[PDB]
Design an enzyme around this catalytic site. Structure first.
Site, PDB file in Angstrom:
ATOM      1  CG  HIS A   1      -1.837  -1.028   1.460  1.00  0.00           C
ATOM      2  ND1 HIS A   1      -1.446  -2.201   2.076  1.00  0.00           N
ATOM      3  CD2 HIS A   1      -3.159  -1.152   1.211  1.00  0.00           C
ATOM      4  CE1 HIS A   1      -2.494  -3.008   2.134  1.00  0.00           C
ATOM      5  NE2 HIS A   1      -3.529  -2.420   1.565  1.00  0.00           N
TER       6      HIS A   1
ATOM      7  CG  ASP B   1       1.673  -1.031   3.608  1.00  0.00           C
ATOM      8  OD1 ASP B   1       1.059  -0.708   4.623  1.00  0.00           O
ATOM      9  OD2 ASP B   1       1.232  -1.823   2.746  1.00  0.00           O
TER      10      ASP B   1
ATOM     11  CG  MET C   1      -0.923  -5.999  -6.611  1.00  0.00           C
ATOM     12  SD  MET C   1      -1.074  -5.401  -4.908  1.00  0.00           S
ATOM     13  CE  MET C   1      -1.239  -6.887  -3.955  1.00  0.00           C
TER      14      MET C   1
ATOM     15  CD  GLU D   1      -8.285  -7.986  -1.259  1.00  0.00           C
ATOM     16  OE1 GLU D   1      -7.397  -7.228  -1.701  1.00  0.00           O
ATOM     17  OE2 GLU D   1      -8.134  -8.691  -0.236  1.00  0.00           O
TER      18      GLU D   1
ATOM     19  CE  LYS E   1     -12.327  -8.584   5.465  1.00  0.00           C
ATOM     20  NZ  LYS E   1     -11.335  -7.745   6.197  1.00  0.00           N
TER      21      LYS E   1
ATOM     22  CD  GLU F   1      -7.616 -11.877   2.130  1.00  0.00           C
ATOM     23  OE1 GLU F   1      -7.871 -12.054   3.321  1.00  0.00           O
ATOM     24  OE2 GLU F   1      -7.094 -10.867   1.667  1.00  0.00           O
TER      25      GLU F   1
ATOM     26  CG  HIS G   1     -11.549 -11.367   1.972  1.00  0.00           C
ATOM     27  ND1 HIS G   1     -11.148 -10.237   1.275  1.00  0.00           N
ATOM     28  CD2 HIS G   1     -10.896 -11.342   3.174  1.00  0.00           C
ATOM     29  CE1 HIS G   1     -10.255  -9.600   2.023  1.00  0.00           C
ATOM     30  NE2 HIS G   1     -10.094 -10.238   3.179  1.00  0.00           N
TER      31      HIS G   1
ATOM     32  CG  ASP H   1      -4.799 -10.880  -1.630  1.00  0.00           C
ATOM     33  OD1 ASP H   1      -3.806 -10.683  -2.397  1.00  0.00           O
ATOM     34  OD2 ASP H   1      -5.443  -9.961  -1.134  1.00  0.00           O
TER      35      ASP H   1
ATOM     36  CG  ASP I   1      -9.917 -10.818   6.974  1.00  0.00           C
ATOM     37  OD1 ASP I   1      -9.784 -11.870   6.368  1.00  0.00           O
ATOM     38  OD2 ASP I   1      -9.345  -9.767   6.641  1.00  0.00           O
TER      39      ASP I   1
ATOM     40  CG  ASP J   1      -5.920 -11.555   6.922  1.00  0.00           C
ATOM     41  OD1 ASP J   1      -6.818 -11.945   6.097  1.00  0.00           O
ATOM     42  OD2 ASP J   1      -5.770 -10.311   7.131  1.00  0.00           O
TER      43      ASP J   1
ATOM     44  CG  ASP K   1      -3.810  -9.746   2.507  1.00  0.00           C
ATOM     45  OD1 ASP K   1      -3.220  -9.406   3.560  1.00  0.00           O
ATOM     46  OD2 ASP K   1      -4.845  -9.126   2.137  1.00  0.00           O
TER      47      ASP K   1
HETATM   48 MN   LIG Z   1      -6.318  -9.194   0.632  1.00  0.00          MN
HETATM   49 MN   LIG Z   2      -8.327 -10.790   4.940  1.00  0.00          MN
END
Ligand SMILES: [Mn+2]
Ligand SMILES: [Mn+2]
Ligand SMILES: [Mn+2]
Ligand SMILES: [Mn+2]
Ligand SMILES: [Mn+2]
Ligand SMILES: [Mn+2]
Ligand SMILES: [Mn+2]
Ligand SMILES: [Mn+2]
Lengths: 384, 384, 384, 384
Positions: C52, C55, C86, C179, C181, C215, C218, C243, C253, C255, C285
């Site tokens: 991002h 980031d 990406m 993406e 979710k 993802e 998700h 992802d 979520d 992850d 991710d």
């Molecule tokens: Mn993701």
């Molecule tokens: Mn997630």
């Protein structure tokens, strides 16, 4: 991964015998003679079979029909060496039970439900069953006004207490195992989880006569961790029976073969049963999918046992691996097993290392090393 | 629908004071002085406030800072007439608690968690709280090897037993209320439902000192029926506190204002609390959404109480309606409340009306009339 | 199971760099310099990193600070051979985005969200990224009146259309990957599944410039079958990024590292990616759990890649096994791949074998042999 | 709240006619003559009825039996003024469909499924239906190897394309409405949500001939927001039919009467249908619970319509309330409806108010006032 008698794998007549009716579809398979199911299961290496009254004796049978069905079944058991460790009542299929058995709003239905149960307890004892399951699939509601739950729990306690009185009065060596389920076929089912059933049992007159019969899929229908619930049942000394199957998350009760569904949870469950030394039968309450013919029925049954045995080997290899044992110490599983304060309350209160001189930041910096541990577990599961 | 003191509505400092941090976002609101929250809540007609130790006293405060924070808070309480019926410990935010408080694998952390708790029990008593909540949000695991649940339950029983010993030794009039939650922030949380917590309490040395603190949203995160779980808690005599909020199904813990989320479940919950004569505070554990400024914070809080009062009126009107009373008899709710077999086991066994002469088809033909009843309930809820 | 460059494994800076903040807890790890993450990931055998804007460049940086952060990052990439395939925008963390970026009700926020995005597209191109992800985590609502969804979808189409115009006007070789979710951090998120995002893309001015970035976790938060959704994305030619992570059912979520969570779904996903010849990066991710120190961070990352490679081997062995190939024919997977009616409509209409002379009972008797097939798949997965 | 013809309420024969079979129970009600259901529904104020082929004509009927069943049905329609706006095919009950209709692995089954469908399209047209629903309840899998989803979607596109060719060749004024469902009776169903079905339609040869038939309960079985999905269907111009009922969260398909289940979602759905001017029938796909006799069947049906009308009144009162209109402006719903950048891309790029001079902190400080708005909505719903 060939099953043996000591493996003590058991199956419900209603499992392999499921004809394939679902909410949206007719039967895909013909009815099985319980004699054939006993023969076929024995050939696969099962140790025994279980039954609902109505699986063995068609509902409404005469005494003479009852006797002949039981006779035939007993011959198959004797022919094969199969055991009958558990029985239960069908208090859900017949329309009369549409609002419940023991907690039906109609008192006449509640009494009838008790009498049906008691008749089959006598049969269960005659066949050598030491566990009597009760799954109240119709106890509950679709709407809020339909069922006063406090009154229903009073009626449920009354019924189980009467059953405990009955087995005690007869001198029977049988114990009850209450099976929770969160929903389906009622919108919400009473005693929806392992926890609610454990709690309910503690209020019965003779709690020692009752345990839980948890089912993999049922706890998963609430998105709960089935190995965690089994651990609590074990901790309480209340795991009197278990139902093994698979379930893919929060949805209708799928009753997939054991191993299917949440595979990692199957791994952790087997690890826990074997590590704890659980001594009850490994019972499968599953349904071969209605896509399958009889060859696929027997394949599905075989697969239940095969998966259990593959997971047993992997879990055993995990726990025996010195690298895993090192990882478990690294993650402080040894410390979790040691008393917090065997020194007692006052000592704790006076211990400056537990408060004024406890370095929170140094403690907080310590990693738990749980990821390395879990990748060791994954490697073992996959044989990598 | 204006709240009054007898309504006994209470709020956590951490509720209206939530700054709006979420897993994916920074705070949207400035921190509130607990003094301002006490003032504002009182102006809305709340009866009292509750706290975590760390909500009232910044973590790591000196004795003199501790004293001054408590002083200021007590002045606001005295200024407003607000009560402090309940307190609890923060055993979840600080990194040191990342694997738990009472069931952390690190023994030094478990002892520290007990000492932190005991310090705040003393404060809670000083402020007049009669209930001490415990939400073990960090007790649990993300992976199967990380946490041996039987050992964890031993450590959990040890901790609560020590706390019971402490309150008994001090002569304190405070009781504990254990708050279940199925997951979040751990992958699975120990004591995930009302049922598991009820069952756990029965194994403690002094069970009478512990009850449940169920939260609407938490049981709903497992797709369970929150009024049913409350009914079981009531039935057991273990409803020592309740947390009210809203939740839209099985997802992360939303902590919406009470009334939001599952509205029909909110209706049935209020009906049950009022019908049972529950006498504890109607406590809100909710978060004004981070979209809101302070005006929306106070609107959300007000809405909690308003919705409770609107549902109370509707449920009362439902139960007082002669047409509903007729419908409840039509559905046999009166019969559910009467003993199945007050005549006793033998009488039941000898009663041919319960078996040989029970007409199953006539019984099965009887409709339960639950749909008409539930549409009366819906009409009452909507004021139609 | 050692990763190689051709494996094309990639990681978000925000993955291994997650400090461990959750809704109920403070950070457990210090912030990572993106330079260190690039170095460490390369040493583990990753092929590249993603970011991002926020980031890589602290929010609110001056041009000179921006330049220096990018410089340092580019040196690490050049030092290691790591790629940047990406990039994406952070349109969720800053308070200004609390009601959305592209579908915020405030028009000034929507324009600002577009300008932030466009700035980082320029950077992404400078770094060689060919895919630009968009996860609208703040697009949605907690309440029904807050967000008119038709108007929101108009604003969402407007924004993506403007972005397509921008990349076209600049001659950039970059495509977008939306993406989905279902929820979290909003109560409901717009474009909640793969399906809703595929459908939305077909309404954009230049649909060829947009695909999905599904993802694992998700789709599972909606209890959907992630391999099925990927298959539909593949079928549509719209799988522009993926992802990879783990998720244990319908809950917040999580992850988790790839492989964790639903292991059998991970197996079927890898089988599908490899069988279809997917050529994009295998991007993770995920978040190392906050229990872990940096050693556990790198272990978790390594485990993502290891699990992918173990599943790749097993799926490959499954598809190459002559016994599986025989089972797939037995279950008629070959027939599913052949046209129903390449003979055309009239021929179908005139074919008495499709109706008057179709023997439904003979067809219905045919078993699908799916259980044997799935036990072969299980045996392969477990290396049994 | 008495229904009228303009209300255009419709019911499936299979709704009130559901005999009460569930996965664990036998029928509780006798079969209804479709003639009686038409009469009874008309007396309650319904506008029309819908059917599966097999609801109207017993499966396997001769031409002469077919003619007589249709004759009787047409007489009841003529006797009552009831309409038949929609029909559909039963491609799920008969065993031959156990692996699907259009996406069965067996090609002979796929062709038979098309021929069955086409026969009933002719009948549907004869009866005046302008919409033809397709719910592929058997399209999907329980295991990963059983169904290659890309091949299945090819077969599904082939089938719908052939049906589009058929209706075009006949000059019929009928359009198709594809009904998503996430699971049940298959472990996962293809086209599981509104989104996946919208996306699939865009790939058909004649997309204009196909829309979605979303069902309240079905999107809720995935924990999705049904009003949001309807809004996306509306936005796409693809809402060709709707199924109304109730559902209590993520569990088996309950098909409760409309209004039951998620009441607040029912409110927001009615608000959206009425605000958008949806002109299709308000069709109920629900099942009176098997607890009910015929009196409760008709009560449940009546309740569907009553709840729709009560919610219509409340939503209308909400939108007409000047205080709500003020609140909607306060929350910037007006701004959401205005283009982000009607000035165009370059203007946006050159607008310093969208970037260099955008005050993020001032924007972020602005509350959305969503809580006050939602409490106005709640007050309106409850008539408070
Ligand atoms: Mn993701
Ligand atoms: Mn997630
Ligand atoms: Mn089951
Ligand atoms: Mn079972
Ligand atoms: Mn909560
Ligand atoms: Mn709480
Ligand atoms: Mn349905
Ligand atoms: Mn439907």
């Amino acid at each position: 991964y060939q099953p043996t008698p000591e493996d003590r794998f058991t199956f419900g007549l209603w499992t392999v015998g499921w004809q394939g009716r679902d909410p949206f579809g007719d039967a895909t398979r013909r009815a099985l003679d319980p004699v054939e199911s006993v023969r076929r299961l024995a050939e696969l290496g099962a140790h025994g079979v279980t039954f609902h009254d109505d699986d063995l004796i068609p509902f409404g049978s005469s005494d003479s029909e009852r006797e002949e069905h039981v006779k035939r079944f007993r011959q198959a058991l004797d022919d094969t060496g199969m055991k009958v460790p558990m029985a239960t009542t069908n208090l859900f299929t017949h329309p009369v039970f549409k609002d419940g058995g023991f907690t039906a709003n109609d008192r006449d239905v509640r009494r009838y439900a008790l009498r049906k149960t008691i008749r089959n307890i006598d049969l269960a004892v005659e066949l050598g069953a030491e566990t009597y399951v009760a799954w109240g699939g119709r106890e509950g509601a679709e709407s809020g006004g339909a069922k006063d739950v406090r009154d229903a729990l009073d009626r449920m306690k009354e019924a189980f207490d009467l059953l405990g009185e009955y087995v005690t009065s007869q001198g029977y060596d049988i114990r009850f195992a209450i099976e929770p389920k969160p929903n389906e076929p009622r919108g919400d089912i009473l005693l929806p989880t392992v926890g609610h059933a454990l709690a309910f049992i503690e209020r019965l007159e003779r709690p020692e006569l009752y345990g839980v019969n948890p089912e993999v899929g049922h706890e998963q229908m609430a998105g709960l961790n089935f190995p965690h619930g089994i651990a609590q049942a074990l901790w309480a000394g209340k795991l009197f029976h278990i139902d093994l199957n698979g379930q893919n998350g929060i949805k209708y009760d799928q009753d997939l073969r054991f191993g299917a569904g949440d595979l990692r949870a199957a791994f952790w469950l087997v690890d826990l049963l074997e590590s704890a030394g659980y001594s009850g039968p490994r019972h499968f309450d599953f349904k071969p999918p209605r896509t399958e013919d009889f060859d696929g029925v027997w394949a599905s049954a075989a697969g239940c046992m095969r998966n259990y045995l593959i997971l047993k080997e992997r879990a055993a290899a995990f726990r025996a691996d010195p690298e895993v044992q090192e990882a478990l110490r690294a993650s402080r599983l040894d410390e979790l097993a040691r008393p917090t304060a065997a020194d007692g309350l006052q000592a704790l209160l006076d211990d400056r290392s537990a408060f004024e001189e406890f370095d929170v930041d140094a403690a907080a910096a310590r990693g738990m090393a749980f990821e390395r541990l879990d990748q060791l577990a994954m490697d073992h599961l996959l044989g990598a």
